[PDB]
Design a protein around this ligand. Structure first.
Ligand SMILES: *Cc1cc2c(cc1C)nc1c(=O)[nH]c(=O)nc-1n2C[C@H](O)[C@H](O)[C@H](O)COP(=O)(O)OP(=O)(O)OC[C@H]1O[C@@H](n2cnc3c(N)ncnc32)[C@H](O)[C@@H]1O
Ligand SMILES: C/C=C/CC/C=C/CC/C=C/CCCCCCC(=O)OC[C@H](COP(=O)(O)OCCN)OC(=O)CCCCCCC/C=C/C/C=C/CCC
Ligand code: HEM
Ligand SMILES: CC(C)Oc1cccc(NC(=O)c2ccccc2C(F)(F)F)c1
Ligand SMILES: O=C(O)/C=C/C(=O)O
Ligand code: SF4
Ligand code: F3S
Ligand code: FES
Lengths: 129, 153, 613, 249
């Protein structure tokens, strides 16, 4: 029979009716600009360490190496750890564990170049065995 | 906060899961390629090193078993020289590759050399290049550790 | 079994989103109507996107030109079977139509000066038939139809018209001569829909798939013309099936006329430009109905080429790789892919293929669908419009001029808009569905779904397509057609021995196979009989046994003092087939060609002449 | 006589407790066209009419017949069947699309995303519609090469793990390809506010330069190049303006 319902217009995106209340110009461009400069300038660094060891090395390697890794893993987390699969409340928790990872790292690295051999040296020793 | 489209995207996935529709096969079926495998390995190396430096600083602090002692509760275990010398290579290769391949990925991030042939040379130029630096870092000291296992006069 | 049915209420509904479909869609959206666009694939997939050569318009970005000379050629190429008013309409509107698309942001190729680029095409000529070859086609190098269609789709979002995509139009909603809406099937979830609408546009492209070989889509089954037939509308000029000269030998992919337009020519086994014989003036750039025969002869007479002596070569290697890569990017590719041929080194294997249908659904210059009797002329069926290929304004008559179709889809689409924004009473409201209405369309579906026949949906389709090719070919003899119409009428009878397999509602492809057959029987059968009944030789149409073009006079000899032949003795008339779908039985009226302009004061009509190229 | 065999993904959505699977088909390469699509069409006609996929052009240009064949995303209608019959070719729908039936993916989210980038010309100085052309020189339209050609097949997008993982928040290469298309057109004025709409973290910055996009485009197009150019505009380097419409135009 043609005794049936009156339905609606199938889900569609209207890009102009959406442009109403929504502009927030909040640009991650500039941050992205710098995290790329960072690694860029951090290039001459990494070979310098093969050449020059010592105790100021250990510590700024660590410094830089933390920043890169922080940023980096933040990026890793927003990839693999996401709401559709995890559900929202747990996806926040991983976004936090990101910063826990920076701290666990830097504090752990700090420790190393104080009360152990250092990084530059930890390598030196492994090469002579 | 999400652009209006991202919002639409969300509801879409809600809708689509609401109909218990399947996801088309992906990593299981996609073809091994130099584009994605390099990129993959780049994370891996990326995270390998960070994972190292975690169980590093953290291990050795939360533990009463410092580095020096570890370094030789391995030296004192009759380990043949080659086996040790690829363990070094292994450690050197991450750092080698992630760095070179790293610079590459900046070009791409600036639309430099982003076309199949120039893409493919890089990927080889750098996969081989690292494998090289890596190897000379391992084997050359090992050379001077024999060049002095017999000084002429 | 049982089915879900859904009701929609829209001002206007458009069946199909081709070029014509979108150009309408956006006209109405723009003036604020509650449109609905129903189509059975994402709009960018319509056959319009394969269009290659260009779109005709006198901007003269190359050399001064007048829209009048373009009108000339249109009427000429039409072999005086077109309506001269429509052709008038088309041709003054063409400069706007195009530029509108450059303003909408189409990346037309460009002249050094900075204006639109233009190329020469088949059939066209300056100064009312006495200049050089006109450069009147505007083009995005070789991708013209594609580029345009995205542009229209791009702009179709800027004006809020609700797209019902992957929907199959089943039939029109008929209220004794009044069109109220459409019935449709929703592939994605099996639900039937009804569309109350004030107005209804059918814009569904040709029926090129009736043949074995064609340059057309798999989707081009002319289900528009099926809807008019099952709504009891008369169809017209179904014997005018254009064959495109340079189909690609193996598959049926088109190689744009634009390649001849740019220089490259035809060659036979002898290694000779045989167009110098058949068209001493235009050469390889005559009208397509001519050129297609020239090839069909050459072959028949053993000057054909290959290991089968049964196609001919299109040659372009004598041209600069520069001009080739730049003015003809796409064909260079398809050459390489299907033929395995490099246009810089070799020629391409080509062979006339069924291309366009100048036939379709009868309309005026106002693009409104019309019935017709001798008794009281032509009564407009209100609520209903048509444009593009499924249309027959007859801007083409017996032979379509090349690159005038994207034109006539832009222009009469755009006319669909302007001419409803002109006569819609913002007072009275949306038509009602009669009780138990639509129920017969669905009934077909049902039995076609569970059809326990014994000949499969696919084997049938094939046989008919073979039999169409053999009979409604380039050259048609009398006893062939009559033997054709014979077989064919057995086939429009085989439809009750029909075998189907997929019983499912959702994305049932075997079933849109079957509906799309049903809808091509009604096409092919009417196509073939109309062909048979015509005893003349004009445009796309050629007879072995009636080589002459029958007009009122005999315009070979000066007119002075000849006797006008009676309306029934000559053949300058539109063929109008009816078929009852239950029986499948065709009976044929004949409408008079419209010979008058729209503004006698602005432009003077063109009296029939001898067709020389 | 030489027989090719094909492995094809299958899902019957209407059937109760439904599961996807691979089905196997033998095909007579002697009685068949040179292209993969050809082979598909054979077995709907001659073995199995339930087998369902999308097709229109057959000339490689509609974009409908997009899928994954022997591991790569490409167009069935322009995919040469692997002659060697010792090896079995395997056909799957565009990866990580939600499937409707058999080889038929839900294309809607993709489409929307296309829409959201506003794929039409827009001008600050509003213009008389039917009147004279807008100036654009030949150097400036060549800039649009490799851009206007996208047939919206979605091959590239379905080949980008980023896009698999975050289809929802990340636009994807097909769409940014086109975004750029509009921002760099010398007749567009919205160039500044077009970039505005994707400045966030996930819209365009979630490209990790994997490069899969370019390697895969059946149309020999270059999405990454585009994306690269976008990231730049999103930061440092700038859009050019028009040269002025010359006098006597
Ligand atoms: C085949 C061809 C035609 C062609 C050409 C090259 C080729 C290969 N090149 C041309 C050129 O260079 N210049 C020119 O002027 N014309 C050229 N042509 C002819 C012209 O392109 C076509 O005739 C043109 O497409 C006309 O447009 P139209 O809108 O009428 O045709 P379409 O876009 O193919 O229409 C299809 C739309 O209708 C919908 N449809 C069809 N059936 C249904 C059903 N059953 N239900 C719902 N919708 C339906 C289609 O789905 C689509 O939206
Ligand atoms: C799975 C494993 C994954 C990795 C786990 C590791 C932890 C990563 C920390 C990263 C920091 C790297 C810096 C190390 C360093 O400088 O050591 C010096 C040492 C000196 O020793 P030594 O044996 O005492 O040698 C003394 C030298 N005279 O170096 C070495 O022995 C190893 C060499 C490091 C590789 C060289 C990098 C080259 C960069 C590419 C170049 C291009 C620019 C253009
Ligand atoms: C100057 C040397 C280095 C350069 C030039 C470099 C380059 C890069 C770049 C460009 C990325 C971004 C990935 C993307 O989003 O496409 C990245 C990511 C990352 N980097 Fe580095 N890197 C360097 C050194 C290191 C080192 C030594 C480590 C480990 C200790 C490291 C750890 C990581 C991690 C964990 C990521 C995660 C993001 C991903 O893999 O996609 N980086 N690196
Ligand atoms: C099998 C191939 C095609 O794909 C595999 C699948 C699983 C994850 C990945 N690789 C990533 O996922 C990856 C790698 C580097 C940077 C960013 C990503 C990201 F963002 F997550 F997409 C690769
Ligand atoms: O020659 C062509 O491209 C076809 C043109 C047309 O169909 O008008
Ligand atoms: S860039 Fe290529 S792969 Fe991507 S949608 Fe366009 S045609 Fe398809
Ligand atoms: S694969 Fe994705 S990562 Fe960017 S380079 Fe292509 S869009
Ligand atoms: S069906 Fe047109 S792209 Fe293959």
């Amino acid at each position: 029979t043609s005794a049936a319902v009156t339905g609606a217009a199938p889900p569609q995106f209207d890009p102009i009716a959406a442009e109403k209340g929504f502009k927030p110009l909040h640009s991650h461009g500039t941050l992205f600009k710098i995290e790329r400069y960072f690694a860029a300038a951090m290039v001459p660094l990494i070979p310098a360490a093969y050449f020059i060891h010592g105790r100021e090395m250990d510590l700024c390697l660590a410094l830089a190496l933390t920043l890169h890794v922080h940023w980096g893993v933040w990026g890793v987390v927003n990839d693999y750890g996401r709401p559709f699969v995890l559900g929202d409340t747990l996806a926040a928790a991983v976004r936090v564990g990101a910063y826990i990872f920076t701290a666990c790292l830097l504090a752990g690295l700090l420790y190393f170049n104080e009360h152990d051999v250092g990084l530059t040296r930890a390598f030196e020793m492994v090469w002579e065995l | 906060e999400k652009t209006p489209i991202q919002v639409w995207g969300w509801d879409y996935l809600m809708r689509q899961r609401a109909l218990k529709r399947p996801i088309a096969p992906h990593l299981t079926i996609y073809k091994p390629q130099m584009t994605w495998m390099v990129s993959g390995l780049h994370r891996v190396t990326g995270c390998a090193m960070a994972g190292t430096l975690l169980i590093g600083g953290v291990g050795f602090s939360v533990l009463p078993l410092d580095f020096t002692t570890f370094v030789e509760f391995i030296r004192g275990l009759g380990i043949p020289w080659v086996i040790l010398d690829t363990f070094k290579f292994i450690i050197a290769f991450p750092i080698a590759f992630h760095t070179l391949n790293g610079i590459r990925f900046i070009g791409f991030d600036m639309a430099k050399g982003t076309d199949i042939p120039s893409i493919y040379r890089g990927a080889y130029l750098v996969l081989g290049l690292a494998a090289l630096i890596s190897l000379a870092v391992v084997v050359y000291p090992r050379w001077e550790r024999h060049k002095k296992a017999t000084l002429p006069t | 079994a049982q089915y879900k049915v859904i009701d929609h209420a829209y001002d206007v509904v458009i069946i199909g989103a081709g070029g014509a479909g979108l150009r309408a869609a956006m006209g109405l959206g723009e003036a604020g109507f509650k449109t609905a666009v129903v189509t059975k694939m994402f709009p960018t997939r319509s056959h319009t996107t394969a269009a290659q050569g260009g779109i005709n318009a006198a901007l003269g970005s190359m050399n001064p030109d007048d829209w009048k000379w373009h009108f000339y050629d249109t009427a000429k190429g039409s072999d005086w079977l077109g309506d001269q008013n429509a052709m008038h309409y088309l041709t003054r509107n063409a400069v706007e139509a195009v530029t509108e698309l450059e303003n909408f942001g189409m990346p037309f190729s460009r002249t050094p000066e900075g204006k639109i680029y233009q190329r020469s095409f088949g059939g066209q000529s300056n100064n009312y038939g006495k200049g050089g070859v006109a450069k009147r086609t505007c083009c995005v190098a070789d991708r013209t139809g594609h580029s345009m269609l995205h542009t229209l789709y791009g702009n179709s979002l800027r004006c809020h018209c609700t797209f019902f995509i992957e929907y199959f139009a089943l039939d029109l909603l008929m209220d004794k001569g009044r069109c109220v809406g459409v019935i449709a099937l929703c592939l994605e979830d099996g639900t039937i829909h009804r569309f109350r609408s004030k107005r209804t546009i059918v814009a569904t492209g040709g029926y090129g798939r009736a043949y074995f070989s064609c340059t057309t889509a798999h989707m081009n089954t002319g289900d528009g013309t099926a809807l008019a037939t099952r709504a009891g509308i008369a169809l017209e000029d179904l014997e005018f099936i254009q064959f495109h000269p340079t189909g690609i030998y193996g598959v049926g992919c088109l190689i744009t006329e634009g390649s001849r337009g740019e220089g490259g020519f035809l060659v036979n086994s002898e290694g000779e430009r045989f167009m110098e014989r058949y068209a001493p003036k235009a050469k390889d750039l005559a009208s397509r109905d001519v050129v297609s025969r020239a090839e069909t002869i050459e072959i028949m007479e053993g000057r054909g080429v290959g290991p089968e002596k049964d196609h001919i070569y299109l040659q372009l290697h004598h041209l600069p790789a520069e001009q080739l890569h730049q003015r003809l990017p796409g064909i260079s590719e398809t050459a390489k892919i299907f033929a395995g041929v490099d246009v810089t080194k070799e020629p391409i294997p080509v062979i006339p293929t069924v291309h366009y249908n100048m036939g379709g659904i009868p309309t005026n210059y106002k693009a409104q669908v019309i019935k017709y009797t001798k008794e009281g002329g032509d009564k407009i069926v209100p609520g209903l419009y048509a444009c593009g290929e499924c249309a027959c304004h007859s801007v083409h008559g017996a032979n379509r001029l090349g690159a005038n179709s994207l034109l006539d889809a832009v222009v009469f689409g755009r006319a669909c808009s302007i001419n409803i924004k002109e006569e819609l009473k913002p007072d009275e409201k949306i038509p009602e569905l009669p009780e138990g209405a639509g129920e017969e369309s669905i009934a077909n579906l049902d039995a076609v779904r569970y059809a326990n026949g014994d000949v499969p949906t696919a084997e049938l389709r094939l046989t008919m397509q073979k039999t169409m090719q053999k009979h409604a070919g380039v050259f048609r003899r009398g006893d062939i057609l009559a033997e054709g119409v014979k077989k064919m009428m057995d086939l429009s009878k085989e439809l009750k021995r029909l075998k189907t397999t997929d019983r499912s509602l959702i994305w049932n492809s075997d079933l849109t196979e079957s509906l799309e057959l049903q809808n091509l029987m009604l096409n092919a059968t009417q196509t073939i009989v109309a062909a048979e009944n015509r005893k003349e030789s004009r445009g796309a149409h050629a007879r072995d046994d009636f080589p002459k073009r029958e007009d009122e006079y005999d315009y070979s000899k000066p007119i002075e003092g000849q006797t006008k032949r009676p309306f029934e003795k000559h053949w300058r008339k539109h063929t109008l087939t009816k078929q009852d779908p239950r029986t499948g039985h065709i009976t044929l009226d004949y409408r008079p060609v419209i010979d008058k302009t729209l503004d006698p004061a602005e432009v003077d009509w063109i009296p029939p002449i001898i067709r020389s190229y | 006589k030489r027989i090719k065999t094909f492995e094809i993904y299958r899902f019957n959505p209407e059937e109760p407790g439904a599961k996807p699977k691979l089905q196997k088909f033998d095909v007579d390469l002697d009685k068949c066209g040179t292209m993969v699509l050809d082979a598909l069409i054979k077995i709907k006609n001659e073995v199995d009419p339930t087998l369902t996929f999308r097709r229109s052009c057959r000339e490689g240009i509609c974009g409908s017949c997009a899928m994954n064949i022997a591991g790569e995303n490409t167009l069935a209608c322009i995919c040469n069947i692997d002659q060697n019959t010792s090896k079995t070719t395997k056909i799957y729908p565009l990866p990580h699309m939600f499937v409707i039936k058999d080889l038929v993916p839900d294309m809607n989210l993709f489409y929307a995303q296309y829409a959201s980038i506003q794929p039409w010309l827009q001008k600050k100085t509003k213009i008389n519609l039917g009147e004279k052309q807008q100036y654009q020189s030949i150097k400036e339209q060549e800039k649009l090469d490799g851009l206007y050609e996208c047939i919206l097949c979605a091959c590239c997008s379905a080949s980008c793990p980023s896009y698999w993982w975050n289809a929802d928040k990340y636009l994807g290469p097909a769409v940014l390809m086109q975004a750029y298309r509009w921002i760099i057109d010398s007749r567009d004025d919205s160039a500044a506010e077009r970039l505005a709409r994707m400045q966030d973290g996930f819209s365009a910055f979630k490209c990790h330069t994997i490069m899969n996009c370019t390697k895969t485009c059946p149309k020999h197009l270059n999405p990454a190049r585009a994306i690269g150019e976008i990231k730049m505009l999103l930061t440092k380097m700038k859009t050019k303006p028009a040269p002025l419409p010359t006098p006597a135009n």
